[PDB]
Design an enzyme around this catalytic site. Structure first.
Site, PDB file in Angstrom:
ATOM      1  N   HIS A 162       0.837  -1.389  -0.205  1.00 51.66           N
ATOM      2  CA  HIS A 162       0.056  -0.139  -0.128  1.00 51.66           C
ATOM      3  C   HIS A 162       0.760   1.104  -0.327  1.00 51.66           C
ATOM      4  CE1 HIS A 162      -3.961  -1.084   0.644  1.00 51.66           C
ATOM      5  NE2 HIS A 162      -3.727  -2.618   0.879  1.00 51.66           N
TER       6      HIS A 162
ATOM      7  N   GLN B 199       4.622   4.466  -4.121  1.00 51.46           N
ATOM      8  CA  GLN B 199       5.285   4.459  -5.524  1.00 51.46           C
ATOM      9  C   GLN B 199       5.535   2.926  -5.898  1.00 51.46           C
ATOM     10  OE1 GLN B 199       8.957   6.922  -3.608  1.00 51.46           O
ATOM     11  NE2 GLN B 199       8.056   6.536  -2.226  1.00 51.46           N
TER      12      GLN B 199
ATOM     13  N   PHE C 155       8.935   0.639  -6.716  1.00 55.25           N
ATOM     14  CA  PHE C 155      10.072  -0.009  -6.952  1.00 55.25           C
ATOM     15  C   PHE C 155      10.407   0.500  -8.842  1.00 55.25           C
ATOM     16  CE2 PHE C 155      10.368  -2.491  -2.983  1.00 55.25           C
ATOM     17  CZ  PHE C 155       9.467  -1.314  -2.190  1.00 55.25           C
TER      18      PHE C 155
ATOM     19  N   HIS D 299      -0.654  -7.173  -1.555  1.00 52.02           N
ATOM     20  CA  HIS D 299      -1.904  -6.506  -3.155  1.00 52.02           C
ATOM     21  C   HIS D 299      -2.972  -6.222  -2.958  1.00 52.02           C
ATOM     22  CE1 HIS D 299      -3.095  -4.763  -7.005  1.00 52.02           C
ATOM     23  NE2 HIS D 299      -3.861  -5.931  -7.388  1.00 52.02           N
TER      24      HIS D 299
ATOM     25  N   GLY E 283      -3.957  -2.688 -11.580  1.00 52.45           N
ATOM     26  CA  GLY E 283      -3.986  -1.548 -11.498  1.00 52.45           C
ATOM     27  C   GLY E 283      -4.596  -0.450 -10.261  1.00 52.45           C
ATOM     28  N   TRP E 284      -5.668   0.706 -10.322  1.00 51.10           N
ATOM     29  CA  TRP E 284      -6.400   1.397 -10.456  1.00 51.10           C
ATOM     30  C   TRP E 284      -7.511   0.860  -9.198  1.00 51.10           C
ATOM     31  CZ3 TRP E 284      -4.857   5.206  -6.468  1.00 51.10           C
ATOM     32  CH2 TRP E 284      -3.948   5.930  -7.070  1.00 51.10           C
TER      33      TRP E 284
ATOM     34  N   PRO F 225      -9.195  -1.906  -7.535  1.00 60.09           N
ATOM     35  CA  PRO F 225      -9.062  -3.345  -8.190  1.00 60.09           C
ATOM     36  C   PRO F 225     -11.080  -3.324  -7.454  1.00 60.09           C
ATOM     37  CG  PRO F 225      -7.219  -3.308  -5.852  1.00 60.09           C
ATOM     38  CD  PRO F 225      -7.270  -1.975  -7.235  1.00 60.09           C
ATOM     39  N   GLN F 226     -11.465  -2.938  -6.477  1.00 54.82           N
ATOM     40  CA  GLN F 226     -12.370  -3.798  -5.984  1.00 54.82           C
ATOM     41  C   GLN F 226     -13.455  -2.308  -6.313  1.00 54.82           C
ATOM     42  OE1 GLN F 226      -9.733  -1.849  -4.085  1.00 54.82           O
ATOM     43  NE2 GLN F 226     -11.497   0.015  -3.277  1.00 54.82           N
TER      44      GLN F 226
ATOM     45  N   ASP G  63       8.006  -8.197 -10.429  1.00 56.78           N
ATOM     46  CA  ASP G  63       8.973  -7.573 -11.566  1.00 56.78           C
ATOM     47  C   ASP G  63       9.164  -6.994 -12.192  1.00 56.78           C
ATOM     48  OD1 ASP G  63       9.506 -10.152 -13.075  1.00 56.78           O
ATOM     49  OD2 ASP G  63       7.716 -10.887 -12.531  1.00 56.78           O
TER      50      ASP G  63
END
Ligand SMILES: Cc1cn([C@H]2C[C@H](O)[C@@H](COP(=O)(O)OP(=O)(O)O[C@H]3O[C@H](C)[C@@H](N)[C@H](O)[C@H]3O)O2)c(=O)[nH]c1=O
Ligand SMILES: Cc1cn([C@H]2C[C@H](O)[C@@H](COP(=O)(O)OP(=O)(O)O)O2)c(=O)[nH]c1=O
Lengths: 241, 240
Positions: A73, A76, A78, A92, A101-102, A104-105, A123
């Site tokens: 959460h 940023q 990595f 996640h 992505g943005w 999800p729920q 990854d």
């Protein structure tokens, strides 16, 4: 004596991790958060329970100081060479590979793809690498974005609790995701925020849309009326059973 | 000395009518309520500011003693013998003849017929006799049933302040409704409260429906989901 970094911008996650990880032997851990986060985390920063960092600039400077990294959460992303050089694991709030992505729920309440929580090895791509552990969460009729997010969050912490030993022991599950699934951008979200008053829908759909956009204390969905008023809408639901 | 009776089950209406009527000369006003406010009004009862009555049974026992009757946000029907025995005037939270009967403002937010307050002479039918005065109120996009009702109730009091002198002097406007309008029964209202998840609608319509059914603290609209949980829904709007 494994050396660990944990990146998060969430107080609750920050608090749970400390709890779980502080319980463990042979572990040292530094916690970072983001700069956007200086105030939310004002008591803890000052106590240095956590420390801001620009991962975009300087993430790669953690290469060589830690054995293990976690993102949970985290505002940023990595850098590639950090992720390619240190084991980095993301915890996640969705069920990869669905609605990557943005928010999800939100998308799950609307489009009915599974939602849940995933822990996976990071990854170069977003919500993309080997899955360690994940579990679906039910969306009930009477729930909004906030209730489903809160089930997901709790599942996240329960799943991390279950697998942190294996990961610190560096013997843990790694399963390839089964398909590429789907991604939603922050623009995909922003385009759903404006209600189209003429759009044709069932009541089921209006309700599913309204509840997916309801997450106190945020203001999300809106319409622009005749006189050009901007009205935000939220839905309340209550099971009487 | 003009002898008046007033029937209400609403506290603020009660003290409103006390203030207005109580500033007039040569009137004597008795206030009544339903037995269902026995408790909620007990303190006014003990101070004899008001007194319950069972209109259905004993209402006719008022016949002979008053020159003028008012009903406003009462739970009770005036019995018809009492109606034809004296001038009875209803102060009513709808715009007659549109959406007569149950929860006028809720139907108006959905079906777009006007809403308002109406002051009218009572006859034997519901929300029906000669109109003394009435005024429309506006329904903005961001208002629910609570918001509109509060505006209507404010308007009721305004209109009554404007015409009480005429009524007291027994010379006041009476026009007939321009038509029979429409009536919505409890059965109509209850049916509207069960959501049809499969019904096709514009979002404008879904939002108008749900805001029309929002009225804190009540729980009105609901759907039965696939496990047959009964789920009550309400909407919040916030002009920004
Ligand atoms: C910003 C925002 C959030 N929300 C809701 C839906 C979100 O799923 C939920 C949490 O979002 P958040 O920004 O409060 O907090 P977290 O999920 O705590 O946020 C962090 O982790 C995410 C994976 C990152 N994408 C965020 O940049 C990062 O801040 O709150 C809204 O309903 N409306 C909003 O404007
Ligand atoms: C009783 C009830 C009222 N209402 C709303 C619609 C009515 O216009 C409104 C007012 O009726 P009410 O509060 O019964 O009080 P009074 O006669 O003193 O005003 O409340 C509901 O939405 N649901 C309900 O179950």
């Amino acid at each position: 004596m494994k050396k660990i970094f944990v990146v998060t911008d969430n107080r609750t996650i920050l608090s749970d991790f400390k709890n779980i990880i502080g319980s463990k032997n042979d572990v040292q851990v530094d916690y970072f958060c983001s700069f956007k986060s200086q105030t939310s985390f004002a008591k803890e920063i000052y106590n240095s329970e956590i420390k801001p960092i620009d991962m975009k600039k300087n993430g790669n400077d953690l290469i060589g100081k830690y054995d293990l990294g976690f993102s949970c959460h985290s505002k940023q992303l990595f850098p590639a060479k950090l992720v390619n050089s240190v084991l980095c694991i993301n915890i996640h709030p969705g069920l990869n590979p669905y609605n990557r992505g943005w928010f999800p729920q939100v998308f799950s309440i609307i489009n009915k793809l599974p939602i849940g929580a995933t822990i996976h090895v990071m990854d170069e791509e977003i919500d993309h690498g080997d899955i360690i552990i994940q579990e679906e969460v039910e969306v009930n009729s009477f729930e909004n974005s906030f209730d489903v997010y809160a089930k997901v969050q709790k599942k996240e912490v329960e799943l991390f609790t279950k697998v942190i030993d294996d990961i610190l022991n560096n013997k843990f599950t790694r399963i390839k995701p089964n398909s590429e699934g789907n991604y939603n951008s922050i623009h995909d979200y922003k385009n759903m925020c404006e209600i189209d008053l003429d759009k044709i829908v069932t009541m089921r759909e209006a309700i599913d849309y309204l509840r997916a956009m309801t997450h106190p204390p945020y203001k999300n969905s809106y319409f622009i009326d005749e006189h050009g008023n901007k009205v935000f809408v939220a839905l309340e639901l209550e099971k009487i059973s």
